């Protein structure tokens, strides 16, 4: 053992609790998504590596039930992630956090991000020229927003929203509200 | 090796890398602040145990600069959080994330939370009679919102906002915007 690697673990934890809790930078948060994605098989492999050395019985019928639970829920959620990939053919359906997606037409193409709420009203704020909709920095936009965005969740929830009210604040900024006007089942 | 105490660690990591973002439940979000608060004077005293042993000075001298890194930001941040307390006599000035506060008058008293941005426009959404301003669930509210909310800083400035536009949606819900109209430096 050495009292240096533990220090680097304890230091990498503060940096994950501070900066990872933000979606306001694209190429900063997919890395955290990948880390959380990879943490799942490591735990199951560690747990199954304790039920084969079932000495003292504390490594026996305890490291078997939890192995079942953690190997069960992982499949139960991978199934849902693949089903979400089926409808919306996007590589965003494999994030280990949610199963709801938000689509925003911008600059010719469409920008897709994961969402956590699926509520009735969605707020949009343009600060200095950059758009920040739902805890997500979504690039560059003047007040030329879209009059219709969509939120998709596998098995129903093709919900179409609508620009209900927009306004301009001093010289660069503005706000807008999207009120859900249509629902679509699958 | 004891492969039963390691899976219990990765499971806790998967648990806290999943539910620690939401600031909605108060009695679930106050605990994360305490846990993150305790990690500084643990890392600080976990890097020092590599100067007690000091085996190889090419590997025992790294934890001198490293322990001089996190013994220096810790003071220069507690100092600032205490000043946030000094102006605003609140107990939210001691969370280890930000150094800006948000004040919302509600049901007679004031509801205070920590805020991270201090932008020019602030959004507010009422869903089913519950108010949600900046990632915090502030309680219960009809459309009886306030024409003035206040964002506070350590020494920076007091910044009063103003109800610029509100709209009722679906007999219970609503959207509102607070466009900054005033700024006051202490």
């Amino acid at each position, epitope marked *: 053992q050495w009292n240096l690697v533990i220090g680097f673990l304890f230091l990498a934890w503060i940096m994950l609790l501070q900066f990872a809790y933000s979606n306001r930078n694209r190429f900063l948060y997919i890395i955290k998504l990948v880390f959380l994605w990879l943490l799942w098989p490591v735990t199951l492999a560690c747990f199954v590596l304790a039920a084969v050395y079932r000495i003292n019985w504390v490594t026996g019928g305890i490291a078997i039930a939890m192995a079942c639970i953690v190997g069960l829920m992982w499949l139960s959620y991978f199934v849902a992630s693949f089903r979400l990939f089926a409808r919306t*053919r996007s590589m965003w359906s494999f994030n280990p956090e949610t199963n709801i997606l938000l689509n925003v*037409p911008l600059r*010719g193409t*469409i920008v897709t991000r994961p969402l956590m709420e699926s509520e*009735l009203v969605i707020g949009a704020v343009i600060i200095r020229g950059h758009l920040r909709m739902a805890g997500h920095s979504l690039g560059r936009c003047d007040i030329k927003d*879209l*009059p*219709k965005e969509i939120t998709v969740a596998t098995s129903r929830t093709l919900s*179409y929203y*609508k620009l*209900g*009210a927009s306004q301009r604040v001093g010289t660069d900024s503005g706000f807008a509200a999207y*009120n*859900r*006007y*249509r*629902i*679509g*089942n699958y | 090796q004891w492969n039963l105490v390691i899976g219990f660690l990765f499971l806790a990591w998967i648990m806290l890398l999943q539910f620690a973002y939401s600031n909605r439940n108060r009695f679930l979000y106050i605990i994360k602040l305490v846990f993150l608060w305790l990690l500084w004077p643990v890392t600080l005293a976990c890097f020092v145990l590599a100067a007690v042993y000091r085996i190889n000075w090419v590997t025992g001298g790294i934890a001198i600069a490293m322990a001089c890194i996190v013994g220096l930001m810790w003071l220069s941040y507690f100092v600032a959080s205490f000043r946030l307390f000094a102006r605003t006599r609140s107990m939210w000035s001691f969370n280890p994330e930000t150094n800006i506060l948000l004040n919302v008058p509600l049901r007679g008293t004031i509801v205070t939370r920590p805020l991270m941005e201090s932008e020019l426009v602030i959004g507010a959404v009422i869903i*089913r009679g519950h108010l949600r301003m900046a990632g915090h669930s502030l309680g219960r509210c009809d459309i009886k919102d306030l024409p003035k909310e206040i964002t506070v800083a350590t020494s920076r400035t007091l910044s009063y906002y103003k109800l610029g536009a509100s709209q*009722r*949606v*679906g*007999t*219970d819900s609503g959207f509102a915007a607070y466009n900054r109209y005033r700024i006051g430096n202490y």
Partner: antibody
Framework: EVQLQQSGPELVKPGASMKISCKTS????????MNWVKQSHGKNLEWIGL????????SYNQKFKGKATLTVDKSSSTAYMELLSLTSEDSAVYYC??????WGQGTLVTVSA | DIVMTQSPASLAVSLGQRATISCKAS??????????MNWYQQKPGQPPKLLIY???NLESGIPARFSGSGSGTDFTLNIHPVEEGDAATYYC?????????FGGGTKLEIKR
């Protein structure tokens, strides 16, 4: 600002097929959904179908299925409805809409010998 | 295949008086506690235009004289200060289910 120009009226015999072409302008062609309406003889609004110009993913009701094909040309910013096996009950004023706010001017389809 | 009906076939309303149109639905909608209903207006020779969405949300550009309300399976459109230009046919739409349906349409006539 936003325009949905129609191709104009046309007359065909029973059993014929045709293509209603709608040309849009004022905005980026993809990103907004397309809806079609029939408004048969009289004053009765109806829903035919809904399509996404960006990737397809069409949706119909159970009454107009097999009677129309909805497609898109991204190169001309155009949307098409193919009317199949037209009969005497198909003569109507068909037109496109986007988000229940903007409508085309109406294409008059007459089915008669 | 959700059916919606409007009670009056037509209205004869003098200037300055209130006009009312009612509609009933076979389904309660009740999606997350929110009802859905769209009110449309059409004039001769023109395509329709949207007036009210989600049972109470006034469309931008529509005067406040048009007030929509209701709940459950009962929906009502109120036009209080009826003027001489309010001569058109008004429609309802569910905007809730994949087989989207429209109402029959009620014609508004003005007395003189």
């Amino acid at each position: 600002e936003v325009q949905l120009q129609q191709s104009g009226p046309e007359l065909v015999k029973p059993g014929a097929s045709m293509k209603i072409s709608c040309k849009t302008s004022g905005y980026s062609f993809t990103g907004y959904t397309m809806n079609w309406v029939k408004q048969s003889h009289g004053k009765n609004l109806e829903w035919i179908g809904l399509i996404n110009p960006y990737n397809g993913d069409t949706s119909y009701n159970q009454k107009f299925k097999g009677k129309a094909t909805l497609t898109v040309d991204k190169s001309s910013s155009t949307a098409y409805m193919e009317l199949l096996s037209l009969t005497s009950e198909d003569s109507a004023v068909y037109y496109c809409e986007v988000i229940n706010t903007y409508w085309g001017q109406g294409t008059l389809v007459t089915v008669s010998a | 295949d959700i059916v919606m009906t409007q009670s009056p076939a037509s209205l004869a309303v003098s200037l300055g008086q209130r006009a009312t149109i009612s509609c009933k639905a076979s389904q309660s909608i009740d999606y997350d506690g929110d009802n859905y209903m769209n009110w449309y207006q059409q004039k001769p020779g023109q395509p329709p235009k949207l007036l009210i969405y989600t049972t109470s949300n006034l469309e931008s550009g529509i005067p406040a004289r048009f007030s929509g309300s209701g709940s459950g399976t009962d929906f009502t459109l109120n036009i209080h200060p009826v003027e001489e230009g309010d001569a058109a046919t008004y429609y309802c739409q569910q905007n809730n289910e994949d087989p989207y349906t429209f109402g029959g349409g009620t014609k508004l006539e003005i007395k003189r």
